[PDB]
Design a protein around this nucleic acid. Structure first.
Lengths: 141, 199, 141, 57, 100, 68, 241, 62
RNA sequence: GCGAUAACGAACGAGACCUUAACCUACUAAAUAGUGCUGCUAGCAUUUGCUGGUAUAGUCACUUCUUAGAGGGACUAUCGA
RNA sequence: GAGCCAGCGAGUAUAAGCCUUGGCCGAGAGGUCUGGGAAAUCUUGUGAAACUCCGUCGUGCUGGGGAUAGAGCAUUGUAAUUGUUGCUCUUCAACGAGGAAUUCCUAGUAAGCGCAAGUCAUCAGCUUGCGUUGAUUACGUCCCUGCCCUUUGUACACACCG
């Protein structure tokens, strides 16, 4: 062990575990660069942990993520949230608490999701209706 | 001005987002203004976002929706017609092709084009039950503006080779100029034309 | 710093590997690739009908490359779509087994895939180099 | 609550009998010993005899 | 020194935890190593059946559940001791089985 | 809304009547004290009692209140 | 100023002047307007962080929390070295220890309870080892009108918040719920002595007294020109003198 | 024309189904011309209501 | 519920309760979970690096991720009306 | 064609057979030889489907839609004729957004999309659950349909369907 942190990040059921150890600016997704995963549109959500604060926070740290679960959008949101958490935890235990306070202020001034995970779950399906709230059609006479 | 080359390469345009948050890194959310002050406190463009997909909690509290990007508002309003419910990636692709096609046609900023179209597509006189004609609230005028724009586009794109983003573009152009060639602007004629008789 | 298959978009990677493997002309394209259909839950043959098998072979070879010890059933379920069952609702159906078996066996004889211990086919030692070098050309552009 | 239900086979038909008993929770051993909303604040032993500056040793 | 495995399941959590602590105490009077306990995810046997004994009324359903909890502990000890370690723990409601 | 039922209110009244000097104006200290004083069989009920007791104390400071 | 909560703990060290470890209730004790500058945030506490004092070596810190553990941190590296466990109650003060179990347990260097002296009756309050070279005696205090010392300093009109000691181990000042500050041979919370003067700087709820948000810690500085005390309004309000 | 009137105080929700609500408006040019009107949609204080005439009174509608 | 009172004291229902969803890098353990390190390897590059593979013996370490038991956590807490 | 992202569950051994992986044949349905699993161990990361990309089509009952019908290949079953169901070729019907009416719904909700479990030799356009994508509009009212409490009238009490 040289310099490492371990943080996660979640959404609907998608879970992303980060591995931010000391490195050379390498930022990967399951072994692939931030420049592509599957999509072409939503890349900027996971660009946000970078463009808000600049690339210089990642000069000597290398990050690995093992996202599994949920769906494409859920995985993207979980990944970017986990990246933000990992960067903050690195600044906490290694770099500077004042630095992490400035970073989390940037995040919370942009999006509370970056630090505060969304606590929403699919409400269970009830008998007498196809959905949680939707009901079978009523036929008076 | 800042060279931060790391182990993985990051493209030139993505190295243009450090100094201005931009929708698709192509439009500026710092110059567009609203013609009238009664449609300002219920719209937020002073908070640029790269994408029209945040999926915020804008239905929880009472006026939680007031703090919603106009781009997400329009994009969400395109998710209708039933078969298109819960297809938001398709809608964001449509809106980016929109912004592009408007910019190829317009000389102003398409953000400004849409903001003007929306602030000029909210009818001022509409009536409730004869119906006693009353003056509509700001947020309501806004939401019928976006709703009518998306409708007009949707029913123009039905049985038409002109694609959905193209119909959206034409509707936005016609509603931006204030001319009675847009589906919303002609409805903006009918609502007041009926409502005046109702007083 | 080099480059591998994980650094490239899938579309162009499978495009290049398929067109190259077609350029060689040593892959045993089955004599039925013009009559047969890709899936029982499919309604038409591939449109680019004279070279679709090479596209499928490139995609399959990359699919083993990214993993280990996959078999014919897993690939059949991977390439199966949603049948149009008529008035009845949609459903996942498995793709063609004979096509996939012949494809992996031809990839065997070109030495691109090997028969792994206790089930499945891994990738061959030379196949790793082939795919990596063919990936390194696209990223230079 | 413990319930026993029986079918009493009479001459004219079947009678049904139900017997519910609400045992006191005090005799409950392998479970709760009081109702949920039963609260058992106790008395006080605060009162005592004091003096300002004592140190007995 | 062997690889005796103890695995035990029940429907009641408290009795199972008491008997597991009992086998821990019994292996702690001696000095048998205790790799576990390890807790398998609980099985929930769900039965959804219609309340009405016929077909009349509003459509209401009962969701009956049986819950099954399994635990494993790996003991490295001579084959003699694990016999008593297990057969002296016959606490009701917990079915225990021994495998090498 | 959150209207406190009669069980919590009577519990708080008897706490204040029988242990006034010990009770404080802090919800956390009141929690740890009501754990020691009463034998509520639920965390939620204990918390509601203790918090409403804290509110009652914070009212009592500004003059006597009728009922205690 | 960075605490999100109520700053209840303050201590100083005679080995590293300008080092301030301000506590709080927000699970974090922090290393330290434009004057107060934060240094490091210590992560690993479950609940209210009652008090912390810098060890005599001038390097580490000994933390207490309402989660029934004494937490031994590492200031220089931001690590914790030992997690003392065994008090069945919130802890709020060989090293002596006080907790809601109404029992004092003794913890050694690695940390393994070895002595279990007992004899109080209600929530033994803050305890301090006497800096008296004459004897290793301790003046303990509790909430049962008892300041028994290991000498019974009893007879109070109620529970007592805490105790403080002289820099030579000769005088202790008992104050808290007992409005009068009884001293042997309103509500006070943060009374402490000084090693350089003749003062009685405390932090009563009503106000500050010598000889609204509230200061639970009013520790003296090392140099003797500071009396800053962290109120519940999240700021410590540096005071020069 | 379109006169601009800023609602300063919020009344109850009148109307048949309760959709409409009474509002008291002011004017940034004719300041002491507070006139009661009724709004179709949601309303808050300080919400400027761009009207089209200001010579009519709305009190209660069916 | 606060209160008003020819009532006073009660009881059921409601609420409590139980199950489940959300939080815990804070205890306890995972060879049927995982992360690392270390062997034996492969493709790229040869800077010790980037991607992986295998070893339930390496008689490796640990518990962020997952599992489950013991608990904690909201009480509308603080503040303005 | 290419990308191949969940969650809830279920499973047997002298069967009359369970989930079934791998290998090999056939376009497919399906067949066969082995292997694992009484199961956080294998089936299974159930690589689900909507969805994303790049191509063909190009406003039309047209590559929309997949009825009805013939031929053929299998599977379960003692027995498929009144097609059990699965697959292949061909046949290519109504239907261009629906009258008077009427149902459901407030946030991870509606709608979309599949998936598993029950029924089960075979058969799911059905229910019971589960997750994936994920909205517009209120956050009010008693106009309608009703419900609760008080006052009031009553020739009602089978209680205004009096």
């Amino acid at each position: 062990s040289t310099q490492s942190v371990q943080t996660f990040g979640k959404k609907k059921t998608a879970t992303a575990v980060a591995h931010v150890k000391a490195g050379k600016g390498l930022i990967k997704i399951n072994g692939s660069p931030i420049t592509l995963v599957q999509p072409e549109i939503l890349r900027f959500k996971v660009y946000e942990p970078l463009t808000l604060v600049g690339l210089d926070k990642f000069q000597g740290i290398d990050i690995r993520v093992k996202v599994t679960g949920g769906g494409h959008v859920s995985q993207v949101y979980a990944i970017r949230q986990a990246i933000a958490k990992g960067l903050v935890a690195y600044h906490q235990k290694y770099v500077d608490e004042a630095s992490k306070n400035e970073l989390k202020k940037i995040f919370a001034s942009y999006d509370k999701t970056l630090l505060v995970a969304d606590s929403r779950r699919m409400e269970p399906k009830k008998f007498g209706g196809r959905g949680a709230r939707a009901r079978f059609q009523k036929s008076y006479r | 001005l800042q060279v931060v080359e790391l182990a993985t390469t990051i493209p030139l345009d993505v190295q243009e987002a450090q100094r201005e948050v931009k929708l698709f890194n192509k439009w500026s959310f710092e110059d567009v203004e609203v013609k009238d002050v009664s449609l300002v406190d219920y719209i937020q463009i002073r908070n640029p976002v790269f994408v029209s997909h945040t999926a915020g909690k804008y239905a929880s509290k009472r006026f939680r929706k007031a703090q919603c990007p106009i781009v997400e508002r329009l994009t969400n309003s395109l998710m209708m017609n039933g078969r298109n419910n819960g297809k938001k990636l398709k809608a964001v692709r449509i809106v980016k092709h929109a912004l592009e096609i408007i910019h190829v046609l317009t000389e102003q900023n398409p953000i400004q084009v849409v903001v003007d179209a929306i602030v000029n597509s909210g009818a001022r006189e509409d009536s409730t039950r004869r119906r006693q004609a009353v003056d509509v609230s700001p947020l309501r005028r806004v939401n019928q503006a976006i709703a009518l724009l998306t409708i007009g586009a949707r029913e123009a794109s039905f049985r038409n080779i002109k694609t959905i983003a193209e119909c959206l573009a034409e509707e936005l152009i016609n509603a931006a100029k204030g001319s009675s060639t847009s589906y919303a602007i002609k409805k903006k004629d009918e609502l007041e034309r009926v409502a005046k008789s109702n007083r | 710093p080099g480059v591998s298959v994980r650094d490239v978009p899938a579309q162009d990677f499978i495009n290049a590997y398929a067109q190259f493997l077609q350029r060689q002309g040593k892959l045993e394209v089955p004599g039925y690739v013009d009559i047969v259909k890709t899936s029982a839950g499919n309604d038409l043959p591939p449109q680019e009908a004279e070279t679709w098998f090479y596209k499928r072979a490139a995609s399959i070879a990359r699919h083993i490359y990214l993993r280990k010890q996959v078999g014919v059933g897993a690939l059949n379920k991977l390439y199966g779509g949603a049948k149009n069952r008529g008035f009845r609702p949609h459903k996942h159906v498995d793709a063609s087994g004979s096509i996939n078996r012949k494809c992996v066996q031809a990839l065997q004889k070109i030495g691109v895939l090997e028969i792994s211990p206790k089930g499945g086919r891994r990738i061959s030692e030379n196949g790793q180099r082939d795919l990596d070098r063919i990936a390194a050309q696209t990223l230079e552009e | 609550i413990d319930i026993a239900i029986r079918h009493v086979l009479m001459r004219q038909g079947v009678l049904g009998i139900k017997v519910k008993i609400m045992k006191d929770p005090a005799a409950n051993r392998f479970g709760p010993r009081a109702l949920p909303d039963a609260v058992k604040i106790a008395e006080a032993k605060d009162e005592d005899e004091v003096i300002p500056a004592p140190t007995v040793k | 020194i062997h690889k005796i495995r103890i695995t035990l399941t029940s429907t009641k959590v408290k009795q199972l935890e008491n008997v597991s602590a009992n086998i821990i105490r019994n292996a702690a009077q001696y000095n048998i190593v205790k790799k576990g306990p390890v807790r398998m995810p609980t099985k929930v046997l769900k039965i959804t059946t219609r309340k009405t004994p016929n077909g009349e009324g509003s459509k209401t359903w009962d969701a009956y559940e049986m819950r099954i909890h399994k635990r494993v502990i790996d003991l490295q000890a001579p084959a003699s001791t694990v016999k008593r370690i297990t057969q002296i723990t016959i606490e009701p409601g917990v079915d225990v089985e021994v495998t090498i | 809304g959150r209207v406190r039922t009669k069980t919590v209110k009577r519990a708080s009244k008897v706490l204040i009547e029988r242990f006034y000097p010990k009770l404080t104006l802090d919800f956390e200290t009141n929690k740890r004290l009501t754990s020691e004083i009463a034998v509520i069989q639920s965390k939620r009920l204990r918390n509601k009692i203790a918090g409403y007791t804290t509110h009652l104390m914070k009212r009592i400071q500004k003059g006597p209140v009728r009922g205690i | 100023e960075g605490h999100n909560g109520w700053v209840t703990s303050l201590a100083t060290t005679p080995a590293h002047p300008d080092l301030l470890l301000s506590g709080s209730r927000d699970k974090t004790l922090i290393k330290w307007n434009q004057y107060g500058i934060p240094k490091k945030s210590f992560k690993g506490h479950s609940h209210i962080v009652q008090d912390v004092t810098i060890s005599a070596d001038g390097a580490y810190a000994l933390s207490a929390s309402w989660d029934r553990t004494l937490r031994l941190w590492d200031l220089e590296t931001g690590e914790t070295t030992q997690r003392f466990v065994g008090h069945k109650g919130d802890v709020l003060s060989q090293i002596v220890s006080a907790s809601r179990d109404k029992t004092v347990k003794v913890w050694n260097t690695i940390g393994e309870c070895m002595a279990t002296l007992t004899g109080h009756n209600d929530w033994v309050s803050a305890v301090r080892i006497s800096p008296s070279d004459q004897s290793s005696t301790v003046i303990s205090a509790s909430w049962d009108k008892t300041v028994k010392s290991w000498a019974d300093f009893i007879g109070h009109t109620g529970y007592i918040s805490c105790i403080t000691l002289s820099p030579d181990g000769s005088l202790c000042a008992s104050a808290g719920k007992d409005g009068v500050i009884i001293l042997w041979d309103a509500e006070v919370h943060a009374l402490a002595f000084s090693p350089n003067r003749y003062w009685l700087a405390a932090a009563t709820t009503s106000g500050i007294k010598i000889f609204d948000p509230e200061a639970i810690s009013l520790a003296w500085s090392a140099d003797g020109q500071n009396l800053f005390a962290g109120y519940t309004d999240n700021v410590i309000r540096v005071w020069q003198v | 024309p379109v006169t601009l009137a800023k609602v300063i105080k919020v009344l109850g929700r009148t109307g048949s189904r309760g959709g409409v609500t009474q509002v008291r408006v002011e004017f940034l040019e004719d300041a002491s011309r507070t006139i009661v009107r009724n709004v179709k949609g949601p309303v808050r204080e300080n919400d400027i209501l761009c009207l089209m005439e200001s010579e009519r009174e709305a009190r209660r509608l069916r």
